A = this chain, B = another copy of it.
Amino acid sequence: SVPAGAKCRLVETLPENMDFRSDHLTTFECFNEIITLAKKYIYIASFCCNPLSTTRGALIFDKLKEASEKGIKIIVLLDERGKRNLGELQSHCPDINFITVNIDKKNNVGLLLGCFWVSDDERCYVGNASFTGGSIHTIKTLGVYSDYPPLATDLRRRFDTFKAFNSAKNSAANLASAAAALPVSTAYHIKNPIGGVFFTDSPEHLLGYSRDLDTDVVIDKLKSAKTSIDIEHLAIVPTTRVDGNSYYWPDIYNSIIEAAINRGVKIRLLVGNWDKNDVYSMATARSLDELCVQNDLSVKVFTIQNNTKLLIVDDEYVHITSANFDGTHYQNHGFVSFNSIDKQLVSEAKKIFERDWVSSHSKSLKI
C-alpha cells in the first residue's frame, strides 16, 4: 500500500529577523538531511548557485563538499545566466560537477528555475529555495520534502530532462536529433497521482507526450474552485517585461477574477509590493482593489524578500512551485511544480497561508 501524502512534509525558511514561526522542517535542516543520508548521488537544480552568501548556506556547501569527497556523485544544474559565481564554486568544490543549462537557445528567453534536490532515488526537496545562501538563511521560502522513493524517483526524471541542455557540443540544446530523442518520462500525472501527489512541468516544448503542462493544471484548478482561492506569489499582474518590450498574458489573472465575480469565490492574494516606476502595476492593483468592495477579493502586499509560491484551492488542492503566476514564466521557463490533494497536507499549507496573511509583514493594499 502507498502512504497517503507520499511521506511529504512542508519545508520553509523562516529568517530570524521576521515574525514567521513554525514547527516545520527548515530548509537548512532539510538540505542537511539529504546530504547526511546520501549514499549514491545528490542532484541539485536552481537558477542561481551562490551558497557562500550567508552562514547557513556556507555550512550546506561544506557538507556537500564533504559528500563529494566521500564518493557521492554531486551534480548541480544552474542556468547559464547564473554563471558569474561558477569559477568561485569550482574553486571551493573541485569534486562537484557544475553544469550550466540553456533550455532555450532558439529565443534565449526560457530560464532554468529548478527548483529541487534529489538523492539516491529516495529523498528529494522541491520548492522555491534556490541553492543560494539567501534562500537557505535570510529569504522566506516554502517547499516540500519527501523520503518516498517512488516520488523522489519521478523528480529525478525531471533532472534528466534539464541536464540534457548543457552548453557543450551535441546536446538537446545544440542539436535537434539529440533533443527529439529525449525520453521525457514521468510516472505520475494528475490522472494518476501517487498517494495524492504529482508533479507538473514547464515549458510546453519540453513536455514530451506524457507530462502535464503546469499552465493547464493551475488554470483548471482555478476554474474549478467553488469556495476559496488563496495565493502567495510575487505578482499576479497580466503584464510582464521581457528585455525591452512588454508582454500581455492574462490567463491566470482572468481565471482568478472570473472565480470571484462569476462564482463568488473568496480570494486572498498575498503579493509583492507595487512600484511607481511601473505605473501599470498600479492600474492592475486598482483593478483588483475595486473588486474587494463587493466581490470576495482581498489583497495584501509584502516588502520582505520572499520566494514563496503557494496556491490553495477549496482546502482540497495545494500548489507549491518556484515560478510566478505570469506569462514570462508559464510560457518559457523550465520548472517543476509540486501538486498534492492530500487533505492533511493541504491543511498544513492552509495553516501557513493564514499565518502569512496576518503577519506584520503583510499590509492591506491601499492606493
Residues A262 and B247 in contact, CB atoms below 8 Å apart: yes
Interface assignment of A126: CB less than 8 Å from any CB of chain B: no
- Residue of B with least CB distance to A257: B248
Which of B247, B257, B261, B283 is A261 in contact with, Cβ under 8 Å? B247
Q: Does A282 sit at the interface, judged by CB under 8 A?
A: yes
Residues of chain A from 250 to 282 with CB closer than 8 A to chain B in the complex: 250, 254, 257-258, 261-262, 279-280, 282
List the number of copies, as a whole number: 2
Given A254-B254, A287-B287 in contact, is the A261-B282 Cβ separation under 8 Å? Answer: no
* Closest chain B residue, CB of each to CB of A280: B290
A54 in contact (CB, < 8 A): no
The yes or no answer to A40 lying at the interface (CB within 8 A) is no
**Min CB gap A19→B, angstroms:** 33
Contact present for A283 and B279 (CB under 8 Å)? no
How far is A210 from B41 in the complex, measured between Cα atoms in Å?
A: 62
**A298: B residues at CB distance < 8 A:** none
- Asked if A291 is at the interface (CB within 8 A of a chain B CB), the reply is yes
Q: Do B283 and A287 have beta carbons less than 8 Å apart?
A: yes
Which residues of chain A (232-257) have a CB below 8 Å from chain B? 239, 246-248, 250, 254, 257
A147 within 8 A of B: no
**Shortest Cβ distance from A289 into chain B, in angstroms?**
7
In whole angstroms, what is the CA distance A286 to B288 when docked?
Answer: 12
- Report which of B250, B286, B291 forms a contact with A254, defined as CB distance below 8 A: B250
Q: Which residue of B lies closest to A327 (CB)?
A: B262
A contacts, CB < 8 Å to B: 239, 246-248, 250, 254, 257-258, 261-262, 279-280, 282-284, 286-287, 289-291, 293, 295
In the assembled complex, 17 residue pairs joining A and B whose CB atoms fall closer than 8 Å, in A order, are A239-B261, A246-B295, A247-B262, A248-B257, A248-B258, A248-B261, A248-B262, A250-B250, A250-B254, A279-B290, A279-B293, A283-B287, A283-B289, A283-B290, A283-B291, A286-B287, A287-B287
